[PDB]
Amino acid sequence: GSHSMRYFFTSVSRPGRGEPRFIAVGYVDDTQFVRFDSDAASQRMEPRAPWIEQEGPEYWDGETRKVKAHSQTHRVDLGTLRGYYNQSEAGSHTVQRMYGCDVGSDWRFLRGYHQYAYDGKDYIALKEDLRSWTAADMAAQTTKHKWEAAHVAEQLRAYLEGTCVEWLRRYLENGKETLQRTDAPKTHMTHHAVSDHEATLRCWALSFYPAEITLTWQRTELVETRPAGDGTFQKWAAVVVPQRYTCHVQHEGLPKPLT
Amino acid sequence: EIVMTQSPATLSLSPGERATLSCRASQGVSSSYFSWYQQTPGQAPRLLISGASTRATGIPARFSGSGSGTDFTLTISSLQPEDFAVYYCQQDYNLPYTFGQGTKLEIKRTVAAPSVFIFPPSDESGTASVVCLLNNFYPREAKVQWKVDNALQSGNSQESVTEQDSKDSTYSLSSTLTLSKADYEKHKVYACEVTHQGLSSPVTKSFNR
Amino acid sequence: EVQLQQSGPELVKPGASVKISCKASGYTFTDHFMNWVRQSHGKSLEWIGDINPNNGGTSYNQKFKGKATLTVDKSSSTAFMEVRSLTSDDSAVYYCARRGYYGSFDYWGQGTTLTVSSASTKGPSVFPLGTAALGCLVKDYFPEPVTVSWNSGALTSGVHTFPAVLQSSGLYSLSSVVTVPSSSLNHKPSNTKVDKRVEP
């Protein structure tokens, strides 16, 4: 099926308390495999999955140096954005960057993306054609001009379509026993009364990978797909009933939908 | 603003030796947005190293760049007569794009005693000037003091230094004592004291009126 | 070959404005941003701003914002910069530097010297001064430059034509000198040659 490799970056400026708190996490589909925390003791990129540990120390050296480069840029960014918006040097601010590359069933490059935020609001983002930028305000318009000058989109497009895809396939092979293997949801049902004549029937969905799943009652109170901690995910959907509308569990790990 | 600092200001080496220039950035700069430039007095700057390591088109193999973060280094394998010029470092990584103060590479040679020479004001206005001169001297540091009636008169020496000799590596200095014909006729002693680092005694040369 | 042909030098009184031309050739003019750098006499380089030729979009150095304005003409593949409210501190050499495709300033123009002064034009007052030293000292003149040979070019062994100094009166003054042993004993702004012989 389809596969995606993503990276999430967060830098929170702390007024007069040192370098900004930089935190980076890397995902293959719904499985995190790398981590970097500026306040950590190791000062290096760390694994979060057993299969990525097969990479030698040369891999971890490179990933550590350029995750620090990402923190180096986000630090200048926070000071630059403080000047763009004429904000005080005593306030705490946040930058968030996320990019990645998707492959299809043929494992060839499918879609790419890159989004950048400041204080939780959208700042600048890369279009689906990987050629132009979309600026939210006049400050981001300056960054768009700045990045257009050095043709950053072309360099980013080259990374998303080549290096990002090549290493996505490489991770999928090394972690084939966990990444390419699906985990079907173990479903059960509970029943509870709520009012004088009505009751609530909950359709549970426990321990499944990937997290993509749909749970509805058609011919419905449902919560966020939450992690269990063991790499699998959970979800439940309920409805108050006094069954023409049934619970249909649909998941990639199931050959046919369950009811 | 990211400040770019180069050191030293002037670097005096011999032709055919290695040259290592430095560039310190006040803030962390990506290596992909660091550049080196060479500029000859009278001519426009030229790109040497782009991306803090990538040589520009046409740049000889004797040039090389390296460094990361806040430290960067330009390296010339063998100094050539064309390579003795001014070198700058910039960052095109954060607005405003900023440069360094620059560093001049001067050909090193043996020390030269300055052939001092005193020049009289012309016959043809109520204003004269004492034209002191140092002929063919190395290095650039040549303290020209002026003793008007045995008194140090600073802030009146209009100096001008020629470029380094393209054959002898020697400088020339024309220290002109800006004064008037009235003040010139009000004193008797008006000489220039040359304290060249290559001399063993400060010299003097003048005359009474 | 990538060529950046800038416009000639300009002398302007304070408080006016001037526009410098920069003709580009030898490449696709819309693929590269164009920058403008200022270099004061004896000082370092200073980035003014950049222009996107495709749409006219500009970013400026904060100090020059309000002083310099950038425009571009894709038809004639030329970049312009307008510098208004000129003062003596605007007297410098201005370059147009093409931004590299991914960064840096790869190609630079030949530069355009901009001189800002209240003086219009003056003329020099040539005051002539085991080896000995001669002397053909030139006095106040404006503007630069002035070629100074020696004995119709038949004496180029010690010709140390010093760089001109700007005096407090807003006037330049240099002093050329050649070397001769004891055994041996044109200002275009004014069109005044001087064959002033020297003898004690």
């Binding site: 990276y7 995750v67 960014d77 954005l81 980013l156 990374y159 290493w167 | 947005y33 | -």
Partner: peptide
């Protein structure tokens, strides 16, 4: 595999 440091400041 992180991309190289080709992003300048904002």
């Amino acid at each position: 595999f992180l991309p190289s440091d080709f992003f300048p400041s904002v």
